[PDB]
Paper text:
N-Acyl homoserine lactonases (AHL-lactonases) have important functions in decreasing pathogenicity by degrading AHLs. Unlike most AHL-lactonases, AidH is proposed to be a member of the α/β-hydrolase fold family. AidH contains a substrate-binding tunnel between the core domain and the cap domain. Taken together, the present results reveal the catalytic mechanism of the metal-independent AHL-lactonase, which is a typical acid–base covalent catalysis.
Therefore, the functional unit of the enzyme is a monomer and the dimeric organization on crystallization is likely to be an artifact of the crystal packing. The α/β-hydrolase fold core domain consists of an eight-stranded mostly parallel β-sheet (only the second β-strand, β2, is antiparallel to the rest) surrounded by seven α-­helices. The cap domain composed of five α-helices is inserted between strands β6 and α4 of the core domain. The whole active site is covered by the cap domain.
Author numbering: 2 to 276
Amino acid sequence: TINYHELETSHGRIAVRESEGEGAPLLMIHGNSSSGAIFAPQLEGEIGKKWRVIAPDLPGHGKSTDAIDPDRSYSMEGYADAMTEVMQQLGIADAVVFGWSLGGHIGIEMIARYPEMRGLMITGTPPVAREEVGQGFKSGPDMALAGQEIFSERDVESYARSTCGEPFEASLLDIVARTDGRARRIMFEKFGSGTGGNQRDIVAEAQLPIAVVNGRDEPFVELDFVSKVKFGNLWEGKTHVIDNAGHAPFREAPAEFDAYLARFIRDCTQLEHHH
C-alpha cells in the first residue's frame, strides 16, 4: 500500500506519498499544476515495490496547502528549497531524484541545495538559460497556459490532456483545477527573468549522473535542442527517447519508462563508487 502523510514545513503543509519499498530512496517531483498522485504507476508498481519512492505535492498543488508565502515558494528555486526541506524532515540526504517537467527544473535547482543527490533524471525538461526558452520549448496553442493564472473549466481540460497524454482520466481535472493559479504566473515570470541559477550552466558543470528521458512525440520540449545540451555526466552518454509517448512517458509508456528509471536507480545506488 501507499503510505500518505503530511509534513508541516516553513512553506506550508506538504502532502507526501511513499511506497513501501525497502531499497534506496527516489524522490519524484511532479510538474506544473500536477500532483505526486500522477506517479501512481511508479508508486504502486515494480519501482515502488523495490525502492522507497517519495512523491510529494508542491506547495499550491494537490493535497498540499497553498504556500504560506507565494513570493518565496512559487519559483523553480523556491520549490527546490521546499523539496530540500522536505527531504531534511524525512531524514534522507542521498535520494536519486526524478523530475517531470517543472519538476525537472526544480531538480536542477536542487543540485546546489542537495549535494549528496545520487543522480537526477529529467523528463519533459530542457535545461535552458533564460534567453534560450524559445529554443528549448515548442511554441504552441497550450504554451501560454504554463504561466496563466486563471484557468476556466476549459483551459483546464486542454492543459490536462496535453501535459498528461493518453490515457485521460477525469481525476486529472481535479488535480489541475485545484492548483493555486498564482503559482503558474509567479513561477513563469521568475523563470523568464532568471531569478534562479542558470540551468544550462548548472547541468554542464554538475558532476552527478544526469539522465534525460523523453517521449518522442513531446509537444512542449524541443528534443533536437535537448540532444545538444552539454551535461557534465550524461547517463549512458546520450539523451533517450521513448516511442509512442509525449510529455508524460512514465504514464503513457510505463514499462518502457520504468526500464530506464530502474536501470538509472541501480546504476546510481548499487554500483561500486570510485572517483
